[PDB]
């Protein structure tokens, strides 16, 4: 289970993914079927030796797969992917810069 | 499993037309994709529809208005989001027990009718956010009662 | 809970984007409305998508073609329905045990692309209905691989 | 749990409901909010006396509620409701008679 | 797992003497053999024993008497079976939703006493089948109350 | 799970089994311990290739086993087995033709 | 719920012909009557049928033959009962932890054929009771294979 | 849940029932339908006052019902019922004294 | 999983401070170690704290005082143990059904205050063991009520 | 379920509790048995009228109870309790001001 | 249910000596008190004991060292706490989906031996916090093997 | 699951374990980490041949592991282990013979 956020900037749709303990050689970022962002990889289990003793185990390991459907008109050739401090960031440029229409409301009452 | 759009709660969605079919279909898919339920927990919300308006409630204890946001998108989508700030309390304190653990979150609801954004009221009080959305007048088109032959 | 349209299975529906949220939301609504799952049991079906076409399978043991119907609605909705006829077998026979109990049923799937109805093939054999829907040619637009900086 | 079918004829949308053991005085057929068909009633439990003894109980009892959303242009004033042999039938006339578009396919293979 | 005879419901069977032992023993065997529960669903039935007779009820909505059968076997076995006919309704109709899906089925009950077949009454009304089986007279042999010493 | 019916004719006990997608080479019909009818076989899974994509899977596959205890006096050497349209039929001849005793009752009320 | 006779395990009982029906019927009756499962726990047993004989195993750790009893009733009912004696160990000892807690119990199995009681062997070793019941010779009446037409 | 044993002596069928904390005024021993032994009563809950505080609760309370089917030929008028040290004992005399047929086997091996 | 000391029930143990954390942590460890729950079943007990004393109840039907033991360890640990003797009833009797199956067992509770052993009363009656432990006098230090500002 | 934090300052132990929608007249702050802090109250359910319609309900209501064991030497008479913005704060003064012993460690690696 | 001290994970606690008893006791108390499990979710941790040292791992994705704290209390209690800061990212951005929702949290473990605080190493890398606690040398006092008589 | 008792005599702590069907060659008794009693072994499953038929299976098989923490001052070199009639007995001598302090109470009431 890789937790991911999906935010939109006037310039692009940005995806974030918590991938603690994953080296960039274990993560794959692609675009399938022309418009499907696919983030996948493996969180390798550190099996080790029998000399060891486990008192607690809460961290998960194994394969992870995440898919988001991008716009039929997205800069598929301009998608960037960065990995730092256990967080993956994918930047999918938008065909044309333009902040989304959102009308804010005042809070008080 | 492909996320294509944002999660917008709609009380008239078709997934509610056959609960068991829906149930039967997702139980096998629980161990997949991702979920916002954890994040959702930071903002338990109620949605009531009185004849006069739609009233939403959100438990946002210890949250300041500068940390919450109520917007309207595409004419009929109420959006509530925010993030409780770090308590600028004594750096160095000893934390014996910490249950209150809130974070970022975003919620959306599909209104039954396009809302008149200038009429939407939002107030924060005693940790409870309240969003009132005034509906348009209608005589609840009277109820038709059919006599059962046979 | 209001039924507004027919149940059309769509593999890209949004209910699959957050399985647990969906799960969490309907479990409390199971004891409501109605369900076609019982009827659905008379036609367990598979849907496979090979690069060349969409292939549907339906277990319809002991059913005759005059009792099954494969139609296409609104350009992209495959519809499978029918009802196994009463076995015109010896009136007066003693029924020790009866498990095979099939009835009426209707199923719908939302195709990814409008189908060329004259190209759709449907065959019934050994109790298995097979519906093949030819897709249009595409080079599977190549897969783009992004080098991960950082 | 009242089981209901929803069929469409060129002339109207027809609804069927299994309501065994229900007298027409216990069933209500209405149209709420202008276009929502509401079928409800109660399947009264025959409590009886303590002299009795129950060896098997599979039949349900209690309240039932069913709602379907009709077309914004349906003969709401022309809806009929019949009850016979434990089956309820509701006929919602369509604004304009017209069989639905359905292209049948041949089975053989 | 070997089926040797027909399923005859008996309220005095020994499987009821130790519910948990029975429970404990079959849970591991659920994934085996076959079951008539699906078929049974087409005829939910009640069995009441008033002092005067045994009364059975069966929900058979939309069923015609020519489709139901009430027989008596081996002196003390009530048998109810049938199959709701296909609704000879407009061939070509569009099926939006189909939940009502009934089929063939057979049910048997072991009467406490051989029944006088000519006294058994069976009526079908408002979708409910009713089978009344007159018992023989007895003074309910009085109840003996033992004084508890000690 | 192979669904089976067990009917009795004056001439024989007839068994039916839903076996969609099963070729007669995958089904076995036998009589064990002298009087136990055994219907078994496999509903082969069409594993296929990874080029494929599954959108829905409701049909079962694998092994199935069904056993019925015949009469100590049944034409064990005269049992027939037919397979057509996904339905298996086994005919176990009775030692002596004779319709079972069944007293029908009138329905009306 | 009325106990009428002793619990005799029979592998060919009819309750096994429809596991789910049986399951479905007792789950609602678990909160009733009584149960010997607790007592049964003092003697977990296996029953194997080799071509030569019926072999029963019973875990009876720390039990002495004078405390166990293997009998045969009504020609075809194996009966195993007993009660582990109190350990005549140091009266006054401190009991830190006690998991081994065995008591009285009786178990019965319905043999497929009347047993020749003088041929039944019973041995106790390493806490395991073993009861061997010699069957009569038979050529396993050969298996008949029916060619499937159609 | 009242735990009961059912033993048979050459003279009668003896039933035992654990009924801790039950006074003989709360237990009823009867014979219904001519041959059904019915043991029932209530294990009254000591509700008490709110001044109290419960640290552990494992003992059950409420109604209990137990039924055994006696022989169509049992001394129904000679059934005795004793209650001592939380254990109820019911003695149902047999029509004719006679130890049950039981063939014991030797243990050794 | 290492057993280091005897199981002593303490109502103020820390495992009760976070039920779900405790729950969440042991569910995965159920299939391990051993358990006294079976043995515990032979002595269901209640512990009530009236202002005047601690009252323990134990269902020990058919048990004689020479078979039960109430001791006090390390100043504040009530200990209840025993073992119902074999009913010296007719050797040769036929056991139709045996549910009452009690065995050895030991239970311990951590008193809130060291008990004055000479003041502890223990009585056995109608199958119920009762242990009363007199507490020391205190005025329940009055309850302080804080006025809530803000 | 009222979520509470328990922090310790050199001067006192501070407790926090999320109590959205609770007026100070519905909350009670006390000290039982001399050293047990008891926070309790009710989150009243706004039942309202049947004219209303509920589309979503996630917020809880009802009674809540929370207990913490203070030190046998705590300023029980100096405990303060404040309620603001749905958060309750209880300040339990310590017998003698004194930051707790805690040795911090450097993070880097 | 009274919280008296902070939750300190101890692998040798007595609650692990009888999993089922513990389980059996808290299931009924789940609907009470409060829980830190939600908060705990922000820092899933592993604890491994190699012969050379105790190694703890904590998934703290996107967390900066100025937001995490590793301390040692009362000689043998490792404490890990923190709170991921708000992403000072574009104020005004549209949040389509938010699953990553972390908050404040504190965790404690009871070391088997008092740790030499100046030897404890803590590093943060790729979202994973690692705390190594060097143990003192010992020859693992050899394993004694007892020959089983009897 | 190997059931074990833990009793204490003035001379030693005695452990008992139900191990029916286990030969002494399949059981291991040791002392790890200097003071941890470890009882382990396997209850071998008698797989046998396919000619066989199983009508009932309640007995368990497989590996079992049990650990008790002895006193830092226990005659670790004087631990005995006996196996008879499916019951294992381990005797851990105490540094100094001495019955535990236990004050008995009178039962009557």
DSSP symbols for F15-39 = EEEE-TT--TTSEEEEEETTTEEEE
Write down which chains contact chain G via at least 3 CB pairs under 8 A. E, F, H, I, L
Tell me the backbone φ, ψ of residue D76, rounded to 5 degrees. Answer: -50, -30
What token pair was written down for G45? 């047993």
CA angle C29, C32, C36 (to 5 degrees): 105
Tell me the backbone φ, ψ of residue K39, rounded to 5 degrees. Answer: -60, -40
**CA dihedral sign, ordered C30, C14, B116, A99:** positive
Write out the residues of chain E at the interface with chain H, using a CB-CB cutoff of 8 A: 12, 140-141, 143-150
CB B107 within 8 A of CB B46: no
E130–F68 C-beta distance less than 8 A: no
Nearest Cα to Cα of residue L91 among L11, L14, L10: L14
F79–G146 C-beta distance less than 8 A: yes
CB C18 within 8 A of CB B1: no
For this PDB entry, the determination method is: X-ray
* Neighbouring-strand partners of residue B121: B132
CB A20 within 8 A of CB A81: no
Write out the residues of chain K at the interface with chain A, using a CB-CB cutoff of 8 A: 9, 11, 44-51, 57, 59-64, 89-90, 92-100, 109, 124, 126-128
DSSP state letter for I149? B
Under 8 Å CB-to-CB from D87, ≥6 apart: which residues?
D16, D17, D18, D19, E61, E62, E127
Q: How many distinct helices (H) and strands (E) make up chain K?
A: 2, 9
Residue H85 to residue I125: CA distance in whole angstroms:
6
Specify burial of residue L6 (Cβ count, 10 A radius: 0-12, 13-18, 19+).
buried
Write out the residues of chain H at the interface with chain I, using a CB-CB cutoff of 8 A: 3-9, 13-14, 16, 18-23, 48, 51-60, 85-87, 99-100, 102
Domains and CATH numbers, chain D: 1-109 (2.60.40.790)
Write out the residues of chain L at the interface with chain G, using a CB-CB cutoff of 8 A: 3-9, 13-14, 16, 18-23, 48, 51-60, 85-87, 99-100, 102
Residue H38 to residue H64: CA distance in whole angstroms:
10
Residue I63 to residue I42: CA distance in whole angstroms:
11
I1–K18 C-beta distance less than 8 A: no
Nearest Cα to Cα of residue F30 among F100, F96, F88: F88
Tell me the backbone φ, ψ of residue C15, rounded to 5 degrees. Answer: -65, -20
Nearest Cα to Cα of residue E133 among E78, E95, E58: E78
CB L65 within 8 A of CB L40: yes
State the number of CA atoms in the 13 A half-sphere of H19 facing the CB: 31
User: Residue with structure tokens 């190549």?
Assistant: C142
User: Residue with structure tokens 């005797």?
Assistant: L91
What token pair was written down for I69? 């033991």
Residue K22 to residue I36: CA distance in whole angstroms:
11
Which residues of D are less than 8 Å from B12 in CB distance?
69
User: Residue with structure tokens 């008033």?
Assistant: E50
Strands (E), chain K: 45-49, 53-59, 68-73, 77-82, 94-97, 105-110, 121-125, 128-134, 144-146
Which residues of E are less than 8 Å from G4 in CB distance?
12, 14, 17
Are chains E and A touching, using the cut-off of 8 Å on CB pairs and a minimum of 3 such pairs? no
Which residues of L are less than 8 Å from G63 in CB distance?
85-86
Among H69, H101, H104, beta carbon nearest to G4: H69
Which residues of E are less than 8 Å from F1 in CB distance?
34
Residue E26 to residue E30: CA distance in whole angstroms:
6
Write down which chains contact chain B via at least 3 CB pairs under 8 A. A, C, D, J, K
Under 8 Å CB-to-CB from I145, ≥6 apart: which residues?
J28, J29, J30
Most C CBs within 10 A among D64, D104, D105, hence the mutation to make, goes to D105
**CA dihedral sign, ordered I25, I30, I34, I37:** positive
I4–L6 C-beta distance less than 8 A: no
Residue G69 to residue G131: CA distance in whole angstroms:
11
Residue B9 to residue B108: CA distance in whole angstroms:
6
State the number of CA atoms in the 13 A half-sphere of G77 facing the CB: 15
Specify burial of residue A32 (Cβ count, 10 A radius: 0-12, 13-18, 19+).
middle
Residue K137 to residue G41: CA distance in whole angstroms:
47
D82–B150 C-beta distance less than 8 A: yes
Distance, CA of J102 to chain centre: 25
User: Residue with structure tokens 């494929």?
Assistant: F52
Distance, CA of B51 to chain centre: 19
Residue D9 to residue E70: CA distance in whole angstroms:
36
Which residues of B are less than 8 Å from A109 in CB distance?
121-125, 130
Residue K83 to residue K111: CA distance in whole angstroms:
24
What token pair was written down for J86? 């749905």
Write down which chains contact chain K via at least 3 CB pairs under 8 A. A, B, I, J, L
The dihedral region occupied by J88, where left means phi > 0, alpha psi between -120 and 50, and beta the remainder, is beta
Most I CBs within 10 A among K3, K8, K18, hence the mutation to make, goes to K18
Cα-trace Rg, chain B:
20
CB B136 within 8 A of CB B53: no
Residue D88 to residue D3: CA distance in whole angstroms:
10
In this structure, the strands spanning H54-56 and I45-49 are antiparallel
The neighbour count for residue D35, using CB atoms within 10 Å, is: 17
Distance, CA of D20 to chain centre: 12
CB F38 within 8 A of CB F66: yes
Resolution (angstroms) equals 2.7
CB F36 within 8 A of CB F74: no
Among J18, J58, J102, beta carbon nearest to B94: J102
G146–F81 C-beta distance less than 8 A: yes
Which residues of H are less than 8 Å from E12 in CB distance?
69
Among E7, E86, E101, beta carbon nearest to C97: E7
What token pair was written down for D95? 């604004």
Among E19, E20, E26, beta carbon nearest to G19: E26
C33–D68 C-beta distance less than 8 A: no
Strands (E), H19-96: 27-32, 36-43, 54-56, 62-69, 80-84, 87-93
CB B9 within 8 A of CB B78: no
What token pair was written down for K63? 């967390």
Name the minimum distance, in Å, from the CA of C65 to any CA of chain F. Answer: 11
Strands (E), E15-120: 45-49, 53-59, 68-73, 77-82, 94-97, 105-110
* Neighbouring-strand partners of residue I109: I9, I78
3-state secondary structure of K132: strand
Specify burial of residue G32 (Cβ count, 10 A radius: 0-12, 13-18, 19+).
middle
3-state secondary structure of B51: coil
K146–L80 C-beta distance less than 8 A: yes
Which residues of C are less than 8 Å from E81 in CB distance?
95, 98
């Amino acid at each position: 289970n890789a937790r991911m956020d999906w935010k939109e900037t006037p310039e692009a749709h940005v995806f974030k993914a918590d991938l603690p303990g994953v080296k960039k050689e274990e993560v794959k970022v692609e675009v399938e079927d022309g418009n499907v962002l696919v983030v996948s990889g493996e969180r390798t289990k550190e099996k080790e030796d029998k000399n060891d003793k486990w008192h607690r185990v809460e961290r998960s390991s194994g394969k992870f797969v995440r898919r988001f459907r991008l716009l039929e008109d997205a800069k598929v050739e301009e998608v960037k992917a960065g990995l730092e401090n256990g967080v993956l960031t994918v930047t999918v440029p938008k065909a044309e810069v333009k902040k989304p229409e959102v009308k804010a409301i005042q809070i008080s009452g």
